[PDB]
Structures are given as C-alpha cells and as structure tokens.
Design an enzyme around this catalytic site. Structure first.
Site, PDB file in Angstrom:
ATOM      1  N   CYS A 196       1.045  -1.196   0.013  1.00 59.80           N
ATOM      2  CA  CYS A 196      -0.242   0.013   0.050  1.00 59.80           C
ATOM      3  C   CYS A 196       0.774   1.344  -0.064  1.00 59.80           C
ATOM      4  O   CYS A 196       1.997   1.251   0.364  1.00 59.80           O
ATOM      5  CB  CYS A 196      -0.960   0.066   1.345  1.00 59.80           C
ATOM      6  SG  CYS A 196      -2.034   1.576   1.242  1.00 59.80           S
ATOM      7  N   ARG A 288      -8.698 -13.672  -6.498  1.00 66.67           N
ATOM      8  CA  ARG A 288     -10.227 -13.654  -6.105  1.00 66.67           C
ATOM      9  C   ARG A 288     -11.096 -13.315  -7.181  1.00 66.67           C
ATOM     10  O   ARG A 288     -12.288 -13.382  -7.106  1.00 66.67           O
ATOM     11  CB  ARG A 288     -10.264 -12.827  -4.812  1.00 66.67           C
ATOM     12  CG  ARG A 288      -9.566 -13.321  -3.692  1.00 66.67           C
ATOM     13  CD  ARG A 288      -9.544 -12.115  -2.627  1.00 66.67           C
ATOM     14  NE  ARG A 288     -10.901 -12.456  -2.019  1.00 66.67           N
ATOM     15  CZ  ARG A 288     -11.398 -11.544  -1.080  1.00 66.67           C
ATOM     16  NH1 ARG A 288     -10.563 -10.486  -0.638  1.00 66.67           N
ATOM     17  NH2 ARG A 288     -12.659 -11.752  -0.594  1.00 66.67           N
TER      18      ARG A 288
END
Ligand SMILES: O=c1[nH]cnc2c1ncn2[C@@H]1O[C@H](COP(=O)(O)O)[C@@H](O)[C@H]1O
Ligand SMILES: O=c1[nH]cnc2c1ncn2[C@@H]1O[C@H](COP(=O)(O)O)[C@@H](O)[C@H]1O
Ligand SMILES: O=c1[nH]cnc2c1ncn2[C@@H]1O[C@H](COP(=O)(O)O)[C@@H](O)[C@H]1O
Ligand SMILES: O=c1[nH]cnc2c1ncn2[C@@H]1O[C@H](COP(=O)(O)O)[C@@H](O)[C@H]1O
Ligand SMILES: O=c1[nH]cnc2c1ncn2[C@@H]1O[C@H](COP(=O)(O)O)[C@@H](O)[C@H]1O
Lengths: 337, 350, 336, 355, 344
Positions: A196, A288
């Site tokens: 991040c 995912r």
C-alpha cells in the site's frame, strides 16, 4: 519521556529546477533500457524515454500498441492470470506496425511484461514465448531478497538471452544487490508492487543515480535507471532525466488517455477516468476474481505525448543538450525555496 | 481535477463512567482474555492472564522478552526475520526455561512465534517441534492469498492442533477473508491504520482506533452468523494505559505492542546514555536489517529507557483495572458490554 | 486541569461526491414544497427545485418575478414593515405573466417570510396580498416560537394557508415542527437574524423525515438552506434528501437582485449582507453597512439555465429522470 | 468575493506594564449613576455569575453573595421556578447585603414574557435584572427596557446585552439600560449553540465598547457600567479586563467548576469532573418542554455538552483568584478599580517564548 | 511565476555517543599557523554580544572572572566606550582570563565609520581584541577597516569581523586579514536589522557551511581562523552542538542580558522578576548619536552561577561523546539529524 527519530531527508521534483545556460526538433530522445559495457551499444534502445506503469489501470495491449507506436515501451501488468498477460503481450507483438515506432528485429512492436516474485517459474516462460522483449520485476523496497531469487532464476535458465529489470529501490544497497544479481535495468521509486501507498522520489533518484555512476566506474557496466512515479508536470520529466534517470515510468499520466483500460466517467460536467493502484484488493488479490481515485480525461496518447516531448526537447535545447546523456552532463539543478 | 476516497485516533475517544455508586476494588478486576477462536459458549484453547503481547520484531521479542512477558501472564511472539534454526532455538529456550505466570500443560512458559508466507513449509514444522504454543503470520502486505495458502497448509497438515493468527486487516473484507481461511485470531493494523508494514512507521502512541472499531463490528457480525468468536488483536500505536482500556472496550481481545516493550531491560536492543538520560535503540521490521536478514549502525530511533518489564506492566495494568472499575466492569467481556464510548471533539487546559 | 467537549461531527457538501451508474432535456426538475399524504399530489409543485433566501439582499418583488418565471419561488424578506412586504408580494401576484410557475388564477407564485413576533398582524396582510406560501424565518434556537406561529396559523386558517418553518439540524427539531403542522421543514445551520455542517444536517433530517413518513404516511418536503457553493452541490443536496434548495449568495449576484452593483478593481461586484446585520435585524430603526461583496454574474435567466442544465446532465449519468429517482439511485461517497 | 472583518485579539496577547495587596479595593458599581453621585448597587468584588442553567441557582447565588458578588438566576426555567430561586437567596439570612441585610441577587429576563416574569422577580426581591438575548441588541430589548421604565421607572434596575460596538452600547444606553454587557466570550453579540473555548475571550470588543462608554460619559455625565461577559478563567485576564474598562466580569465555566454549581459531579478515571452545557443547548433553549424537571431523563449524548474540571469550593477559589488580582493591581500602582483604568499601561505582546 | 532560489536549527541535531572536570573548555580567539599557539586563548568558550543591553563594564569584569571576554558595545561615544574598556582593564584581578599585566582581558566593538579615531582610543585604553559590528554583513567597508588596523598596528592589535554565512563571506574576510570570523547563526542571515529572531532559535546551517570553508582555507594555507557562532543559543546542548560543528567560541546576547551584570533594569512582572531588553536594531542603538523596551527577558540571577551550570553540562555532554577538549569534539563527535522528537 522523549523519543528521537532519525529519518534521512527526502525531496520531490517540485523542490528542484533546471537552470538553462538550437533547434528543438534536433534533440534526440533515444535512451537505453538494457545494461551495456563501456563503449558498447545497448541491446534495446527506445526512441522516447517514456514507459507505462505495471498496473491494471494503465498497461494493457491497447496501451502497449499506442506507446510503442510513439517510441516507448509498455510493461503489461502482471496482476492477472499467466495466460491473460501472455495473450496481452501476444496481441502487441502481432499487431502490424509514425517515424518513432519502436520495433524489434522482426519489425514487431516492442513490448514489456511485469512479473512477480512468486510464480515466475511458470510466468516467465509463457511471457518469453509470447514475444515479450523485456521483463520487469514488479516489487517494492522491502522485497529485495525475493527480487534476487527471481533474477537468479532468469539468469540460471536463460542467461542473458532474456532482458529483465528489477525494482523498486531507493538507496545504494538496493541498487547494488539487484545490479550484482544481473538486472538489465533498475527501477527507482518509493512504491511498486502490491504494497500500500501513502514523495521523496527526487532524493531516491539522486541517491541511486550516484550509486549507478559509482558502479559504472567500478565495473565498466552502465545500468540504466528508471524513475518510477512522481511525475506530475511535463517539466518534471526533463528534471528526472537530468538527475540521472535514463527513462521514466508513469501511471496516472497514461491512465487519462483513450488507450487506457479504465472507464471514462462524466463527473460534474468534466470527463474523468477511473484509477486505482496495485495495492488495491482488486489488483493485489486478483486471484479472487472498487475505485481508488479519478483522473481527468486527456484524450489520445499521441496528442499528449507529443506535447510533453516538445517541452522536453525544447528544454534540452535551452540547456545546450542534443541528447539525454548530454543533458545529464551539462544540467544545472538547484533547489527552489 | 482529482478526487480520492476518514480515521480517528485513541486520543479522540473517552469512556463515560458508569452510574453505579457501589465501590469497585481494582484488584478484583480480571484481565484474562482469549487468544484463539472458540465456539459459542465454550472455553478458548489458550487464555492469557493479561491482554498484552509483544510484537513480532527483532528489537522487541527475543527469548529474554518471552520469559519476562510470560511471567506476567502475557505471550511474546518471537520474531521470524531470522533463520529457522535461530527462531526454534529462541522458542525452545523459553519453553525449557523453568517456571501470574502463563504456563501450558507441562508447566512450561507459553511463547509464540511469527511465520512468513514463503518458507512456512519448513519453518512451521520446526517451530511446532520447538514447542511453540501459537503462531502468527507476519505479513508486510496485509491479507493476501499467500496468507491463505499458509493457513491452508497448517490446516491441511496439523488440522486444528496448531493455532495460527494472521493480519493485518482494517475492514470487513480483510477480517472475513482471514476468518474464512481458518485463522485463530485476526490482527488489526492500528498503529499505522494500514494493512501493510513498511519502513516508515507511525509515531509512538498515535494509533488509529477506527480500524479496530470496523473489524470489531465485522467480528461481532461474523460471530452472529457462524457462532464462532474470533479474538481480535490491536496491533501497535498504544503506550498509554487509557488507550489500552479503550482498545479493549472497543472490541480488541488483546493488544500487540512493539515500542512499548522495547524500552524495558528485557528488550534485545542496546542501552545507551544520551547526555545523562538512559535510552534504548530501536528499529522497525521495515528497516533493511530486518527485511534483509538473509544477507547477514542500523539504528532507526532512540526510545526512552523505562526499567524492567515487571515494574512497568504492573503499573500500566494497575491503571487499566482502575479504569475498568470506573466503567463498572470487573472483566474484559463486561467492559466491552458496558462501555459508553464517546467521541471527544476537543480538550483544553484551565 | 483538562476540559472535554463532545461536539457532534459535521460535514460540508464538499466532502461528498455523486458517482454515476438518457437525454438531459428529458429530466424533470419538478418537486413538491407542500406536505402531501402517501400517494397524494402536493398543493404546490415547483418546476425547478430552486428558491431564493428570505433576505433583504436577495428576495424582492423583482427577484420573485424572475425566479417564478423560471419555475421557482422567492420568499419575500420579512425584515421590513408589514405593508412593504405585502406590497412586494402584491407586486408579484399582479405582474401579468414554458416552465413558468403560476397559481390557479394564472398569477406568478410567490412566498413570503414571517417572524415569530408580529405574525398576528403580518400573516393576514400577507395572505390578503396573495402569498401562495409562507415560511417562518427563524433559527434552531427558536423552535418553541416557531411552533407558536404554526399553532397560530393552524388555529386561524387550518390547512388553507401553507407555512414552512426553519431551520432545524436534528431529528428532534424536525418532528416538533412536523407535529405543529409545518408544510415543509427548512434545514440549515443559520437562518433568522442570528449571526453566522450543512450536509450532516441534511442527512440527519432526511432520515428523520423518512422515518416520520413511515409513522404517519405524510411526506414533508425538506429545504436545504445555505451552503451551495458550486452548481454540482445542487444535485448533491437533492440526492441527499432535500426536495428543494434555498440559495442566498447565488441569487444576489444577478441584475434582479436589489443590491447595488459596484465596480471593484475592474471587476463588477454586488453588495451583500446577512439578516444578522444591524440593517436587517433592526430594520425598525431605519423605518452603507456592507458585510461583503459577491461577483456580478449577469441575468438570473442565463445563470439558472446553466446551473440546471448541469443538474439535469448529472441526473442523466445517475440514471434518474426525476428528483425522486435521484434520491433512490444516487450513490454518494466520501471524498478526501 | 471580498468580505469584511475587524482584527480581534484575545486577552493572552496583552500585558500590563508595571503596595500592600490587602488594602486594594475590589469594589465596583453595576448600575448607572450621574457624575459625582454614588451608585445604587456597589459590589464588593467585580465578579458575577452567568445567567445559565449550569451556573447560577439559589446555592450559587448565596455563595457568591457571601463573597461580595452577585449571581443572575437563569431565566431558562418557569417564572415560578426562577422566582423561587430568587426568593430562597433573599430569605436565607465581605458579604454583599441590601438595606434589609439580605443577600443581593440578580435574575435574568427574556424579551418574551417580561410582562409576567418581571413582576414575579421584583416581588420575590430581585435587586437587579438582566436581559438575556440570543440575537444581540434588538428592538425587543428596547421594548423590554421601555416596559420596565414605564411600570417601575428607575426602582427596578435592568441591564442588557450583549454588544461589541459603539452603536450597540448607545442603543441600550439611549433605551435606559443600567449596565451594558460586552460579548467578550465569543466575540459576538449572539449566544448560539457552539461556545468558544475556556479562557479565549476577545478583548477587542471590550476595548471598543469602553471607548464608546467613556465618550457617552463625557457628553451626558452618565456612567454606564460595562460587563465583560465570559471568556475569562485566568486571574490575569480578570485584571486585564478590569484595566481595559470593564467594571465587573461575568463568568460561566469559571463558576461551573465549583461544588455550588447545580450540575452533576462525576468521577472520570479518578478525577472529579462536572457536567456542563451552554444556554444554546436544547435543554436550556427548549426549556418549555422540560418544565417540571424533564431534563434528568436526558442521556449523556443528549444533555452533557462538556466536562469541566471540578475545582472545589467557590470561596476557596475566588479568594485565590482575587488575591492575585489585588497583587497585580499593586504592580500597576492602583489601590482600586478606577485607579487601574487610569494608570494601566496596557501593551500588546507580539509573541511569547520559552527560554 | 516568481521562482526564488534550506536551513535547519540546533533543535534538529543530536550528538550520537560513542570525568567532566578533566574536560578542557579552552579555545582560541585569534588566527594562528599550523603548529604554533594562539595569542589569546579563552578558558571558557563564551563571549557576550556587542550590544547596549548585554556588555557594559560590569559584564566585562564578570565574564572575565569565569574565563570569557566581553566585547564592549560600540553604539556609544568613543570616550564612553574607551572608559568602559578602561574600567575592565583597570579592575584588579580560578579561571580568570588575564593578560601579561595580570589585568582582566576585555574586548571592544568598532564600526566601519569612525575607526580612524575610535580604534586608537580603544587600543590606548587597553582593549585586547576588537571586532567589527556590521549591519549589512561582510562588505568593502569592513575590508578597509581591516586594512586600516593592519596598516597602522600591523598584527599587534587583533580584530575580528562578521557576519558571514557562506564560503565566499569567510574567504573574503580571511584574505582581508581578519583574526576571527563571526557567523550569523542567530538570525541565519548576513545582516543585523530591527526584527530579531527568537531566543534559542539559531540556525546551525550557516555554522556548518563556514566551518567547511574554514577547514578548506586551513588545509590550503595552514592558517587557522577561529569561528564564532553569533547568537541563537541559550540551551547548553546547543553550545556543545555549536562547538562540535566547528565553532571555537560562541557569542550570546540574550543569554547574558538575563543576569544581574546586565546593564538593563530589573522589573517585577507580576511576582516574577524580569529584565528589560532591546536589540542593536532598535533606534536607541542605531541613533545613539542623537541621544524604549523591545522585550522582557527572564531574570536568571548572576553570571557566575548560571555560566557554571551551563558549562558543567557542556563538560558532561563532551564526556558522553568521548572528547576531553574542544578540538577533540570537532573531530570525534557524530552529529546526526533528528527527523522528529515524540513524547511518550
Ligand atoms: O497502490 C500502489 N501500491 C504500490 N505502488 C504504487 C501504488 N500506486 C502507485 N504506485 C507506484 O507509483 C507508480 C505510479 O506513478 P504515478 O501514478 O505516475 O505517480 C507505480 O508504477 C508504482 O511504482
Ligand atoms: O518498520 C515498521 N514500519 C511500520 N510498521 C511497523 C514497523 N515495524 C513494526 N511495525 C508494526 O507496528 C507494530 C508495532 O507497534 P508499536 O507498539 O507502535 O511499536 C508491529 O507489531 C507491526 O505491526
Ligand atoms: O447573517 C446571517 N444570519 C443568519 N443566517 C444567515 C445569515 N446569512 C446567511 N444566512 C443563512 O444562509 C442562507 C443563505 O445561504 P448562501 O446561499 O450559502 O448564502 C440564508 O437563507 C440563511 O439561512
Ligand atoms: O450555548 C452557548 N453558546 C454560545 N455562548 C454561550 C452559550 N452559553 C453561554 N454563552 C455565553 O458565554 C458566557 C459564558 O462565558 P464563559 O465564562 O466562557 O463560560 C455566557 O455568559 C453567555 O454570554
Ligand atoms: O536588533 C537586532 N536585530 C537582529 N539581530 C540582532 C539584533 N541585536 C543583536 N542581534 C544579533 O544577535 C546576536 C545575539 O543574539 P542572541 O544571543 O541569540 O540573543 C548578536 O550578536 C547580533 O548578531
């Protein structure tokens, strides 16, 4: 009850200024992206010093064709299936070939591909087979060890027949660790990968450029440097090149264009485009399968790049420099208060 | 022409005192808490005597820290930014060190060990063979598929005998992902309000409570669907005792502290004299010396020296128990049930 | 020696954003301003969701004519004599007159502001002058006296006279005026002659209004008063629950505004002052005091046409052909 | 868009440029008087309590009167309830007493029910009244002052406020106000919901109104006492306010900390705190809905606006505060309040720094 | 649009560690060649500023007993300053700084205007060291003032110059024959104007840059020119940091104006004793030929009591670094940048 912290000082591109000391169309923007010995010629030479970031929001096959048409290289994003990235690379390599078009020895569009430090044993052969001209490890500062294992795999299986870059690093130790591991270029930036984000890009580029030049004297091998992120204005490009960067990686700059894969949105009468970093869950956890920000729509890549590079070429003329190495030699860079 | 898509710190919250006029004795306050998941109405497999654990850091959790914190009822997570052999040796040194105290079945100290998402196939067996009571995935990127694959590996080999926690998360998606992957406790990135652990660390005692409140809301919602209670760990950003009580009241089951423990004698860093005042060296796990442990001066910060762990933890928990008496709570579950937490807009000196 | 303060969090319009998910001229900007039962038709339906503030510097007879022509309602300011306000209301109802807002007698629709003091003499004079709707120009701190004015109107006129009340910022403030019979509830931090968070107050009352709509079946329209800095804030307030918007500084920039046009450093400006200024709060003393200047923007017709075209364009992107469709489909996110 | 505002400055930005402190006279008038004549009411100390639900009740009025000050019972209650509080102070049996040797107490009135509240408070024995307006000086304060001067003439003394300017002072002065209040606490004439911080009063409005009061005294020969309303907690700010022209100071949160305050005392993590709320809060603003003690059903989220630190007794704290006010007056060379206002060398502190 | 062509304070630096009575605070004032001794050597590295409010004849005596030299302010008549220099050099004598005549060593300030008549009167009164008090910084008029003393007194009279912040400023006054060079640390600028900076808010960047230029000039000529850190320091740790950064002695104004020996008046500011103060930029100093309070500084007592406190901590700080004298501190001290300080 006092705690002392000792962080090194960092600065951004906006704290510096190129001080000028005569045909702008006579300036060459060619630059190397693969390491080369002293006197020799690089195996891959771009015609412009721009590359597009390794991000889902930036570098697809449409971006790769468009940027290669202008003389740059797109690094197809690797936060997708191995088959998808290879198919994206293959579409650029097979799109039929603009005086600055960047082509390979078989007159195909040059393209790059991003790889991660995890599935490289299956990802690298597929991207090589797809025709990827150059690879780049898409990681961050704290994963240098696993960048080295990935470079070792490439050199152990392919030798120097597959060009691969690595990054990001910010200091001497990071540059040298990837340099001695065989990196064909080194990416400099405070981010990269799926970590991040929260600049210090100028200090990071200056520090690594000093270590690169030192490494050049020590070994006779010139390793090109890629400044990754932090370019907000077109005059930052010339500043980054003058600080030592041989080419520049941009994300938000390219996400504004038609060839960007994100959606165009009308936000309060102003056309904008979706944008998100590789730290987003849709990118970090692509297995995912959510918008982080919006950037203003800018139009075609060709029209904007030509404007940005005219400013670069005209600035290099004012510095008495007809090529990028000449700019890096004659540039006067001072602080702005 | 550009738009982005709020958080608060523990300094902005306050516990409203309870209405009770009955006198509360702070010594009768129980600070026991679960650390591994359990079904509704059942007892946790591991219960700490105090809600404090030490961080998975080179500058905090060595073997000496593990014995000191276990003597006070807590658990230390031995750092995993080192060789698998040196970590199992530190784990074994705490277990085999002879023994209120937090002990296992064999009356040995309870110690934890951190693991990563790369060499778990050979590091997890070595640490379990070393006698580690609970593991924890120390990730620098947040919840990812590599934390899941590590959790899938442990469950596929040891079933539920080995207990492993994971983190960090800040939202409901992060919690449910690691919860549905089989994690025994979920760690919340409170210290920096982020899911990643990168070189630039937030200030001492400046943690973000918003991430803890959001995960506690998802944990209670998840506990209401499945009947499984996942203990939440508040990771970092706390030194003040009142922030510990707030964290517990907001839903945290135990608190992980790094810089709080690095000040003590049992911290593995060097004590230095800085113009009379004793100081302690410190560096985060994002520093090059920790991130590049395979390749092997190195001081990121000086933290103040605070003496022994037994003396400081006893003072910190003496105020936690006293604060819980003011809220009308005799145990941590009562605190989370009776706490009236309000938001403070501003403070002022008179 | 510490002191602790527990102020509720308050957000402005600039902290939110409308995310889209259609021909703009197909969008209907009609909206109700008088409470109506579940499934009924409101007694007064504006064609555009714009109303002008109850201020000396904004709403006069010239403003009421111009805003009613475009489809809005001006609330003639009440910080003046009863005869002066009734005369200005009469001047609008007697102006001869596509989106024009007209009453049953083909006359321009106009509103009038009343205070919680001389309503026993001001309300009949405004009713006699033809005021299509009244509005109690007050603040949060005078809810009780807002109720008494409502209790007066309902006692003397029942539902034959439409009167709104404001301002409120909370659930408790909305229900109080709702029970008293307010035909609409104005939401804002300021209002009245007080001296001078709009998004939070609008979201709060919209929830109380929606909750009150299920308890009784009566839909009480909400008026967002103040805080509209840019044109895209209009679509934001409507999507948040407001049925129409009250603007002060937005309208005083026009020719039809009663304030003086002034050349200031080559830029044409217009005078402006709030109802908290002495010339407005103490108008009785006056049977010069310029608080600030606003830039001269031109004609009301040309600016309203631009502001609403952006509103209609944004609602098309959100897939909404009317304001009720907008309030249901709108995705509002926080923006740093 | 250009806007107009005047430079405002707090009390902490001013300094007094430099005797037995016990001999200092803290006496001051609170009602208007002609030139040369004495005042009808002369407080022994220059402190009055604020017309607030959380400050001035019968207990606060008694304690402050024993120390020489006056409390103004809050009007945010029924006329019967306020008259009973005023009556309990009077019939309770240095100290500030009236001719009947009963404690001197004040009461607050509004511009709405004065035709019934004023007679009830006068009957109860109120020595002085004060108009509490949330909107500032208005025609409704004039109509209230006109009613009092009509029925009672000058028998009943009434003050008004708040003001921050010359026009505001002269408006209430030409309306017959016995003293004028300056909106120092928030620098505004209004009493709205949000309140300024403890001890952040604006001295600018006090100085600007003091100049208008001195000019009005030079024309008519009538001296209107000025009240500095709120924004002061430190003792030096009290001496500063008195030096700038304030004849007496009204404090809200200063008195709420004391045990004589009607608010609840609370043990907050080992430290005693007292609940607090301003008159802009709904419990005080909508008092007509909690007429028979309906406010004790309110919760913390609804009723408590602030926690102020408990400071003990009123007599203990006011003796400490005034002992340093008397000592500061010694450094200025003044033995009384009028001498301070004429000898004070008030300078602006551009900055303060630690060494 | 209006692009303009970065300094850090002493608060942002920390001395990284490796008998305080054994520590020697002796330091030179005057220039010397590599190998020889200094003509004037201090016992402590503190001087008082050339200001009306800090350096009278009482300050000169008091600072001389403790081992320092006071530069008498030149914003007075030539006879008034000479009489002040005369009183200190005539007051009868553990760490006192004395000349060969066993009289108190004192300094005096001069300007680039009346030096042809003011320098003789000060030397005639017995001033050991002189220093040019300039308002514009290093300039030609400072060079011609230096050329005057060197042409009339040779090298018998020692004169210092300033202020400088840069390499060019040091070398200009160095080649002009200045005995020591003064660095504008207090204001971080070359000038001495009306608005003075805050107490203890000196800029260490100018001290580091000039020390780099002083060491270069020393390695190229073999002539050591002592460096003076002028102002911006009241904290003892900033004294040790300045000494470690290259400064050989430190010039302080507000530090000494707080003591009883200050020429200003003592006032009682609400139970706290304070001292009046004004800078040389005030009209009472710059218009001294035509002939109030700019600041109230906290009264601290006597010079001996406070200077002994500051230096006892300086010696204690120098032990924690591993240095027994000021030269060793300039070579062994590890100075790092503090990104921030937090309170636990
Ligand atoms: O989400 C993120 N995580 C990690 N790196 C990021 C992220 N977003 C941007 N970056 C870095 O910043 C670059 C984009 O540069 P820019 O958008 O032109 O400033 C990328 O190529 C990455 O190196
Ligand atoms: O290098 C660092 N940068 C950012 N976060 C860190 C770093 N090292 C450790 N952390 C995290 O912060 C926690 C320490 O919290 P502390 O109590 O504030 O010291 C650890 O348990 C990690 O979750
Ligand atoms: O002086 C004031 N006192 C009280 N409310 C005011 C004042 N000035 C503006 N307002 C409020 O703000 C509204 C105008 O909002 P604007 O369009 O954003 O200027 C008015 O209708 C009032 O509700
Ligand atoms: O609710 C409030 N909002 C704004 N001002 C208030 C409020 N309540 C009281 N005040 C004013 O502030 C004064 C209190 O000042 P204090 O001494 O700072 O507490 C009162 O006497 C009023 O003039
Ligand atoms: O009036 C002034 N304005 C600006 N600088 C001054 C003034 N007076 C003295 N200085 C400088 O400040 C130094 C001492 O300041 P201090 O020791 O930090 O208080 C002197 O030696 C001068 O260089």
């Amino acid at each position: 009850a006092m705690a002392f912290y000792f962080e090194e000082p960092s600065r951004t591109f906006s704290e510096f200024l190129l001080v000028p000391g005569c045909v702008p169309t006579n300036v060459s923007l060619k630059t190397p992206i693969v390491k080369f010995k002293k006197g020799e010629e690089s195996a891959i030479t771009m015609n412009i010093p721009l590359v597009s970031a390794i991000m889902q929001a930036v570098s697809d096959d449409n971006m790769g064709i468009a940027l290669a048409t202008e003389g740059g290289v797109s690094f197809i994003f690797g936060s997708q299936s191995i088959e998808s990235e290879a198919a994206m690379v293959s579409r650029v390599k097979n799109h039929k070939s603009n005086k600055l078009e960047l082509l390979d020895s078989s007159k195909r569009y040059v393209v790059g591909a991003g790889i991660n430090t995890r599935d490289y044993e299956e990802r690298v052969p597929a991207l090589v087979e797809a025709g990827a001209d150059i690879l780049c490890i898409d990681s961050s500062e704290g994963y240098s060890e696993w960048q080295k294992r990935t470079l070792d795999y490439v050199r152990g299986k392919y030798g120097d027949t597959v060009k691969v870059g690595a990054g990001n690093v910010v200091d001497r130790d990071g540059f040298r660790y990837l340099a001695e591991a065989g990196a064909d270029f080194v990416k400099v930036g405070v981010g990269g990968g799926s970590i991040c984000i929260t600049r210090g890009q100028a200090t990071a580029l200056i520090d690594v450029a000093k270590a690169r030049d030192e490494y050049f004297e020590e070994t006779g091998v010139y390793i090109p440097i890629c400044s990754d992120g932090g370019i907000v204005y077109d005059y930052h490009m010339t500043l980054a090149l003058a600080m030592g960067a041989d080419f520049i990686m941009l994300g938000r700059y390219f996400s504004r264009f038609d060839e960007s894969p994100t959606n165009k949105v009308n936000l309060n009468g102003t056309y904008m485009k979706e944008y998100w970093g590789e730290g987003a869950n849709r990118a970090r956890n692509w297995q995912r399968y959510g918008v982080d920000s919006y950037v203003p729509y800018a139009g075609s890549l060709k029209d904007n790049v030509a404007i940005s590079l005219s400013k670069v070429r005209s600035t290099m003329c004012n510095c008495g420099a007809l090529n990028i190495p000449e700019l890096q030699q004659k540039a006067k860079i001072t602080l702005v208060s």
